[PDB]
């Protein structure tokens, strides 16, 4: 009944927390941002399309779609760039936007939500940045780079807004608790 | 050089995230709350005491101590132990905020420098039905979790939002705060 339109092992792991059986499937959606598209609009669209793209292969199902980007001074986002990309993040608040869609392919009902999560980075030195790339995992070693994590749900940062998903599931009469 | 003064397997797992060599040892402390001791005073005291209790065993080291308490309507709340008490705790949590205070201490036994901090984390609950409460307890059996839920797992099904500096703090070790203390002692995990 429940389908995750993703082959991400992180998203898979997160969904397993809800203890509802599901199957994974790759959506094969082009995630390239459009010209005048905001971060919020983009992940919203991508979440929806990923869920809707599987509707014929899984035509009597609740299909979960999700997408995430981060914004580094208003820009949507090799080991070579990480040095710069961490250099860009340094001393700044980097906002992640995570879109979520639950599509009922049986009756066409769609629920969507976009949830922000702010990562406040420490002022980093070049050495730190170098050392870190030599060795981001917000649930792991990336904690060494942060001053503060600010958002509704730490699962969102990892890539699936589970609190929001539970609400959507409750609306579809599939409270994980029942 | 780094020592974790803890009998907790999850504190060990969390500290590993920093990728610094350490050893664990069980601390020697009275964990009993004292009379009129507030939740924040308790976890600060216990964190400092755990770290300091290993100073003679580990006299040239950085020693980490930590303690956590769960607070519901101003009252320290322990492990439920029974299903009845688990349902009771969750009724108290329902539509409410559960606050965890996590004390942290780093004691340098070589130069005697002690750093301590208490960091809160607030778990905002949904308004839960009796059926939801009964189902969670039966599925999860959180009988040895103070507050009667597991935030890192199926407990996410109960929450409206999570409010705090660092998700690790909720799991029982404030890692952002610990990193700061380690840097202050010239032991940056990134160095």
Numbering used by the authors:
A (entry chain B): 3 to 79, 84 to 141, 151 to 193
B (entry chain A): 3 to 193
Study text:
Maf (for multicopy associated filamentation) proteins represent a large family of conserved proteins implicated in cell division arrest but whose biochemical activity remains unknown. Here, we show that the prokaryotic and eukaryotic Maf proteins exhibit nucleotide pyrophosphatase activity against 5-methyl-UTP, pseudo-UTP, 5-methyl-CTP, and 7-methyl-GTP, which represent the most abundant modified bases in all organisms, as well as against canonical nucleotides dTTP, UTP, and CTP. The protomer structures of the four Maf proteins revealed a large β sheet containing seven β strands (β1 to β7) with two α-helical subdomains on one side and one long α helix on another side. Thus, pyrophosphatase activity of Maf proteins toward canonical and modified nucleotides might provide the molecular mechanism for a dual role of these proteins in cell division arrest and house cleaning.
Screening of Maf proteins for pyrophosphatase activity against a set of 57 noncanonical or modified nucleoside triphosphates revealed that the YhdE-like Maf proteins (E. coli YhdE, BSU28050, YOR111W, and ASMTL-Maf) also exhibited high pyrophosphatase activity against 5-methyl-UTP (m5UTP or riboTTP), pseudouridine triphosphate (pseudo-UTP or Ψ), and 5-methyl-CTP (m5CTP), whereas the two YceF proteins (from E. coli and S. typhimurium) were active toward 7-methyl-GTP (m7GTP). The Michaelis-Menten constant, KM, of the YhdE-like proteins toward canonical pyrimidine nucleotides varied in a micromolar range: 32.7–53.0 μM for dTTP; 29.7–72.4 μM for UTP; and it was lower (to a lesser extent for ASMTL-Maf) with modified nucleotides (4.7–47.2 μM). Both YceF proteins also showed high affinity to m7GTP (32.8 μM for YceF and 30.9 μM for STM1189). Therefore, we propose that the unprotonated Asp88 of ASMTL-Maf (Asp70 in YhdE, Asp103 in YOR111W, Asp70 in BSU28050, and Asp69 in YceF) functions as a general base coordinating a water molecule to produce a nucleophilic hydroxide ion, which attacks the alpha-phosphate of the substrate. This is supported by the complete loss of activity in the ASMTL-Maf D88A (and D88N), YhdE D70A, YOR111W D103A, BSU28050 D70A, and YceF D69A mutant proteins. The structure of the inactive YceF D69A protein showed no changes in the position of the side chains of other residues in the active sites, suggesting that the loss of activity in this protein is caused by the replacement of the catalytic Asp69 by Ala. Alanine replacement mutagenesis of the predicted triphosphate binding residues in ASMTL-Maf (Arg24, Lys65, Lys100), YOR111W (Arg30, Lys74, Lys116), YhdE (Arg13, Lys52, Lys82), BSU28050 (Arg14, Lys53, Lys82), and YceF (Arg13, Lys52, Lys81) produced inactive proteins, confirming that these residues play an important role in activity of Maf proteins and suggesting that they are likely to be involved in the coordination of the triphosphate part of the substrate.
